[PDB]
Amino acid sequence: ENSLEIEELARFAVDEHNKKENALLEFVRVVKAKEQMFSWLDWEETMYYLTLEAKDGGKKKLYEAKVWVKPALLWSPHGNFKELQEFKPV
Amino acid sequence: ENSLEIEELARFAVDEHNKKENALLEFVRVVKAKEQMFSWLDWEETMYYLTLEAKDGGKKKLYEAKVWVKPALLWSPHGNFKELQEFKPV
Amino acid sequence: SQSNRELVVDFLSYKLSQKGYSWSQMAAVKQALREAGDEFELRYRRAFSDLTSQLHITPGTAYQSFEQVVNELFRDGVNWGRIVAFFSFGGALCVESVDKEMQVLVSRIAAWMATYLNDHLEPWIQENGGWDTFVELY
Amino acid sequence: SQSNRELVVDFLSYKLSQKGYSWSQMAAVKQALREAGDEFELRYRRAFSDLTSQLHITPGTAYQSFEQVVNELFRDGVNWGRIVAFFSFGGALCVESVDKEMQVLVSRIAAWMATYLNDHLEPWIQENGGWDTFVELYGN
Motif (BH2) spans which residues (chain C)? Predict the structure, then answer.
């Protein structure tokens, strides 16, 4: 499906949160994903708004995460990169 | 002459505090005053540290006020610019 | 043809300024005057308002009217603060002119400002060490 | 003096820009570049921090070595976003030079920058409507 893309983005979100906050959340699943289109000058960016389930001390819980997919600046021709904009519990 | 200016700065302080706080304090007298000279570029401004008694609904409590006085630009009938910094009980 | 070089110097002058550096001594003077003017406009909002209310530029206004208000600003002598006020005052007159769909009068105001600086203020400025002394004071 | 005239034009251009006006069409171009530059550096901090570190500037460094690292920046398509990146790069080089007490390099980097615009980017700029088109792109 397309889903494989959305699941990678929720996984990334958790992994990056763990890196930033020294945390131990375990990804379970994506509950709900929304996209929007954004532009900066003549560059296309995509913001992903994800709701996901993840365990904190084994207790399954709900989290809202915002993830950019922005174009890549140098050497790799038409590449992207991800970046966790925001990550919060519902 | 120096003394009368201090009183007028005490009166303004009460009157101004009376309009922000929607309070009805009645000025009585100035117990104590000290002043500090600030620069801005090559202009001299003054900060006044005032202690004043005033009747809070008939009861005569002490207060501390800071008034900030800046030199006028074009001539004014009002003299200098006055601004209330803080007004709080002892 | 000098277009691109101009964008370049302007951009680098900006980027250097963000770090407390400057492109040239003149750029240092212009940055100090921009920041001093904004600070004047906050810290002396009521006084600046009173100054600005003295004169509204219209197509029929002449230099003498501008010189009249500004002479009053400097009646007790020249100092750096009053110089900053004279710049903000000019700025406000231009902005007011543009507000009214008459940008054409902006040139008049710029010429008038330049003329007043050169005829009345420049001796004081060189007497007191030039615009480099403004820069350290600010 | 010319210099007092310059102080005045620069002050008024600024005070106009704070109310959304401009002194001229050029002062507009300058303003949009400044603001686009700050935006680029803020939102692509790592990719900018990346690009800066690709040239160690010294007083022996020559144009071609600057030409090469920018020839890199644009090889898979010129766009406005990337022209902003090019300006920002020059800015970081100038700041670096001044950090090491080599202010003499600043005017050399600007000259390189201007050479690279006039030789390699000016065709694409005129073909894409010129700098006025950038100002309109940045506006909405």
Answer: 123-138
Number of domains in chain A: 1
Cα dihedral D29, D30, D31, D33 sign: positive
Dihedral sign, CA of B36, B41, B44, B47? negative
Q: Is the Cβ of C15 closer than 8 Å to some Cβ of chain D?
A: yes
Resolution, angstroms, 1 dp: 2.2
Q: Contact partners of A by the rule of 3+ C-beta pairs under 8 A?
A: D
The DSSP secondary-structure symbol of B73 reads: S
Method by which this entry was solved: X-ray
Q: Give residue A27's domain range.
A: 1-90
| A64 sits in which H/E element | strand A59-71
Contact B81 C47 (CB under 8 A): yes
- Spatial neighbors of B82 by CB under 8 A, at least 6 apart, are B9, B12, B16, B67, B68, B69
C108 within 8 A of C57, measured Cβ to Cβ: yes
Contact status, residue B46 vs residue B69, Cβ threshold 8 Å:
yes
Q: Residue D85 is nearest to which of A73, A75, A78, comparing CB atoms? A: A73
Structure tokens at D139: 């506006």
Tell if the CB–CB gap between C79 and B41 is shorter than 8 Å: yes
